[PDB]
Design an enzyme around this catalytic site. Structure first.
Site, PDB file in Angstrom:
ATOM      1  N   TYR A   1       0.830  -1.197   0.000  1.00 12.59           N
ATOM      2  CA  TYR A   1       0.000   0.000   0.000  1.00 12.59           C
ATOM      3  C   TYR A   1       0.867   1.251   0.000  1.00 12.59           C
ATOM      4  CZ  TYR A   1      -3.649   3.379   1.041  1.00 12.59           C
ATOM      5  OH  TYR A   1      -4.535   4.439   0.974  1.00 12.59           O
TER       6      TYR A   1
ATOM      7  N   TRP B   1       1.071   5.604  -1.965  1.00 12.57           N
ATOM      8  CA  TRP B   1       0.672   6.547  -3.003  1.00 12.57           C
ATOM      9  C   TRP B   1       1.717   6.727  -4.093  1.00 12.57           C
ATOM     10  CZ3 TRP B   1      -2.996  10.635  -4.101  1.00 12.57           C
ATOM     11  CH2 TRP B   1      -4.251  10.377  -3.537  1.00 12.57           C
TER      12      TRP B   1
END
Ligand SMILES: Nc1nc2c(c(=O)[nH]1)N[C@H]1C(S)=C(S)[C@@H](COP(=O)(O)OP(=O)(O)OC[C@H]3O[C@@H](n4cnc5c(=O)[nH]c(N)nc54)[C@H](O)[C@@H]3O)O[C@H]1N2
Ligand SMILES: Nc1nc2c(c(=O)[nH]1)N[C@H]1C(S)=C(S)[C@@H](COP(=O)(O)OP(=O)(O)OC[C@H]3O[C@@H](n4cnc5c(=O)[nH]c(N)nc54)[C@H](O)[C@@H]3O)O[C@H]1N2
Ligand SMILES: [Mo]
Ligand SMILES: [O]
Length: 771
Positions: A111, A113
């Protein structure tokens, strides 16, 4: 000798000035309504001394690959190795896990960005490699809406939080009141998952300029409240359900709720009203009852009820208030309240769960959307092993454990290898000290990173990755308008020994004999032409002409589309409101589920069949003598989480070389803390240093420490002290409830004290030991 190159990031389209081969300036390629300082530090990102400059391996791991003393992670000395050796080592260690345990032994949920871009999506490229070599264990959900994205499908039949909103043009024309409920858009719309089109902030300023009412309901007087000159309603963190219940009760008591709307468009209101009026538990949920809990005066609660019911009101709910224990209840109750107001599906009315995120509501343009790389190249039973991602520490520590999740049962897998490429869990995951122990359990931990993050410092093998500015790519202006195709032209060659994640995984693909399936025989620019031509064809079908790729690329400018009248006038749930029998929701009843039989039949102790107030373990209402203050961890103005923390932007907010903590002057004076003092914040989980920012812009009894500061532990022979102020050292690591099992940071209590002594040097932005 001097040139300007156009590229992009999460924080928008960027012009980069290059002077004799060196980046010397960066800024917006398209003038924004409000300056976005995130766009000004490309040079910092490229040349920082925190960058990983060479493939590195932990000394103790080299001594015994896959069989090391894993308690040395985070504590060891680093050995420089060649790319050849590092890649052979990664391949061998992953192959050993596959040979002994198969795909269920590898976690590559990874996980994060990372960076925008269709091709150089580090997380997708990792998972594409993993799937090319047999699969991996992924995760479910995300940290942003872990609770709301599970409950909203039960209530509305759709995920809701990542969907286009009622047009901002409709809000500008018809909304009398917009309520920013746990929403800080002038902070949180400085970025988008792709590249922010920058129009969302503009629309908020246009609404401010109209003179109409803007209300902010938030424990802090946020950047948005101050910059939009809005009305601040201070509220205790994690008490929005009581406040909504008090507003709801007032509506009923005054006959101001929309009984016609509730009858036609909702299901189960009667069961909820019994709870609201105290007929099931003996406690009417009055404004006076709510005021005791949430800190909003009862008469203010009543006036909100009257104002919401008499004016066209749009309830804009952000996500901080569902990133906490029982977070599912908050947006469920927000929808319930909007139903009682009866304005859902009207111009400028109802609710919206993405007006604060990636420019929701900006009218959808008519054009095309580029393609992007997938994790699917062209025995693996890992699907049953995927878990709600915030259980990561629990999984590593308790293989084989079973948990409840959204009406089903999940068995944790037995993870031997962790590969992260584009995320920073030792900053983003809750209860850092517990995560440290969890990361001692895998046999091998691999990280592709641009910089020496706290996560990289906890790995066995760290591979240097490039920034977006060292490669070519494409992205869109978004996340909902899709109004432009942004080029991401390479500005400089890769720095140091850094490699594009793409090239890293090609090399590992070659070692496993799956290069052709990974690359599909395409070069970087051939990938981009394919992605571009997907938009070209879709634009054509929409009667929009686009230039050929080579023409577009040579021009190195954004290519923009226009929105039509249908998009500018679009009202979310407008068709449902016109005829709910012909346009039903995807719920069991076809209506808004104020009461959900599906959720009730799960028989969970921490989530009933309708929205309800359930006291969390830690919040303002049950602070103690030992921990008398409540904590909230909002997202930062001068970072994207942990990104850019190492840049010169740090000077814009660091207090005494620590992350600033907002503290009320009365809570500061009681501790002898003055503005600028270094303070020690501690909870049952850990302790951090911060810099006091004494201000009335936070509700008394609560302190705010922004998420994203780089964890920098001070080892003094134990729960060591973070020297820099990483908020998640303090937070609880627990599921919101058995329904969603989301992450629950914003329900937390702490103590603060003035720090006495000499302040430790912050070392987390410097090269690690033995580089
Ligand atoms: N207490 C508290 N905790 C929280 C939150 C909160 O509100 N309060 N919010 C949560 C939420 S909503 C989020 S989304 C998460 C954010 O969690 P993260 O997404 O992990 O935070 P980032 O700083 O964006 O980490 C991205 C990393 O990717 C790296 N990177 C960037 N580009 C590249 C690339 O091209 N290749 C490679 N290999 N690496 C790259 C960056 O250096 C950076 O270290 O935090 C969550 N944790
Ligand atoms: N500049 C910048 N922009 C970003 C990000 C970033 O890190 N930096 N992160 C991006 C991403 S990954 C995400 S998921 C989104 C996050 O979108 P959000 O979740 O909305 O961001 P938060 O700061 O957590 O928003 C919560 C706001 O409401 C407050 N709040 C927190 N808890 C509560 C509560 O219980 N009740 C009430 N009434 N208010 C509360 C916070 O003080 C804060 O002002 O933003 C994105 N935009
Ligand atoms: Mo997020
Ligand atoms: O997110």
């Amino acid at each position: 000798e001097m040139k300007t190159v156009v590229t992009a990031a999460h924080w928008g389209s960027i012009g980069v000035v290059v002077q004799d081969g060196k980046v010397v300036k960066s800024g917006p390629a398209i003038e924004p309504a409000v300056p976005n300082e995130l766009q000004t530090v490309v040079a910092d990102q490229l040349y920082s001394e925190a960058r990983v400059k060479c493939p590195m391996v932990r000394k103790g791991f080299l001594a015994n690959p896959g069989k090391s003393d894993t308690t040395m992670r985070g504590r060891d000395e680093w050995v420089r190795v060649s790319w050849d050796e590092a890649l052979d080592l990664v391949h061998n260690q992953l192959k050993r896990v596959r040979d002994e345990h198969g795909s269920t032994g590898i976690f590559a949920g990874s996980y994060g960005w990372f960076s925008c871009g269709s091709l150089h999506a580090s997380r997708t490229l990792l998972q594409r490699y993993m799937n090319a070599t047999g699969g991996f264990v992924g995760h479910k959900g995300d940290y942003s809406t872990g609770a709301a994205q599970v409950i909203m499908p039960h209530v509305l039949g759709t995920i809701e939080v990542y969907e286009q909103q009622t047009s901002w043009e409709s809000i500008l024309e018809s909304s009398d009141i917009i309520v920013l409920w746990s929403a800080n858009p002038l902070t949180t719309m400085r970025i988008a998952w792709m590249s922010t089109d920058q129009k969302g902030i503009e629309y908020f300023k246009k609404f401010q300029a109209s003179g109409k009412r803007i209300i902010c309901i938030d424990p802090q007087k946020s950047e948005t409240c101050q910059m939009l000159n809005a009305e601040w309603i201070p509220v205790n963190t994690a008490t929005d359900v009581p406040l909504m219940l008090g507003i709801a009760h007032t509506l009923v008591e005054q006959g101001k709720h929309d009984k016609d709307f509730l009858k036609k468009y909702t299901s189960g209101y009667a069961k909820f009203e019994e709870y609201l009026l105290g007929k099931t538990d003996g406690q009417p949920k009055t404004a006076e009852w709510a005021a005791k809990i949430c800190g909003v005066p009862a008469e203010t609660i009543k006036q909100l009820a009257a104002d919401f019911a008499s004016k066209r009101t749009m309830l804009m709910g952000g996500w901080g208030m569902q990133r906490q224990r029982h977070g599912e209840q908050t947006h469920w109750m927000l929808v319930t309240l909007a139903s009682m107001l009866g304005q859902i599906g009207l111009p400028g009315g109802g609710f919206g769960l993405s007006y604060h995120y990636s420019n929701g509501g900006v009218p959808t343009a008519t054009g095309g959307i580029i393609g992007s790389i997938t994790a699917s190249p062209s025995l693996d039973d890992t699907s049953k092993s995927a878990f709600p991602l915030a259980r990561i520490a629990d999984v590593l520590l308790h293989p084989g454990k079973k948990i409840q999740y959204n009406g089903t049962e999940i068995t944790y897998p037995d993870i031997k290898a962790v590969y992260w490429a584009g995320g920073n869990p030792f900053v983003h995951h809750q209860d850092t000290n517990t995560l440290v122990k969890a990361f001692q359990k895998p046999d091998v931990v691999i990280v592709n990173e641009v910089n020496w993050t706290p996560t990289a410092r906890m790995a066995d093998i760290v591979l240097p990755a490039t920034t977006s500015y060292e490669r070519n790519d494409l992205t869109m202006a978004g996340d909902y308008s899709m109004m432009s195709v942004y080029p991401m032209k390479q500005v400089v060659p890769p720095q140091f020994e850094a490699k594009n994640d793409y090239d890293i995984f090609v090399e590992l693909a070659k070692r496993a004999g799956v290069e052709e399936q990974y690359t599909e025989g395409k070069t970087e620019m051939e990938w981009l032409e394919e992605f571009y031509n997907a938009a070209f064809s879709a634009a054509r079908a929409n009667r929009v002409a686009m230039p050929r790729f080579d023409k577009f690329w040579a021009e190195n400018k954004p290519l923009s589309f226009e929105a039509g009248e249908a998009a500018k006038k679009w009202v979310r749930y407008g068709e449902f409101r016109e005829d709910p029998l012909l346009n039903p929701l995807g719920t069991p009843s076809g209506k808004i589920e104020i009461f959900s039989d599906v959720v009730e039949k799960m028989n969970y102790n921490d989530c009933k069949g309708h929205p309800s107030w359930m006291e969390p373990e830690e919040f303002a209402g049950n602070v103690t003598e030992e921990y008398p203050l409540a904590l909230v961890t909002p997202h930062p103005y001068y970072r994207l989480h942990s990104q850019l923390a190492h840049t010169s932007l740090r000077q814009k907010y660091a207090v005494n070389d620590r992350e600033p903590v907002m503290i009320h002057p009365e809570d500061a004076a009681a501790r002898g803390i003055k503005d600028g003092d270094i303070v020690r914040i501690h909870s049952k989980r850990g302790q951090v240093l911060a810099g006091a920012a004494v201000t009335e812009n936070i509700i008394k009894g609560t302190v705010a420490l922004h998420e994203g500061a780089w964890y920098d532990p001070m080892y003094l022979g134990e729960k060591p002290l973070c020297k820099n102020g990483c908020a998640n050292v303090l937070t609880r690591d627990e599921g919101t409830s058995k329904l969603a099992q989301g992450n629950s940071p914003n329900t937390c209590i702490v103590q603060i004290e003035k720090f006495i002594g000499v302040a430790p040097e912050v070392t987390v932005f410097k090269q690690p030991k033995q580089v």
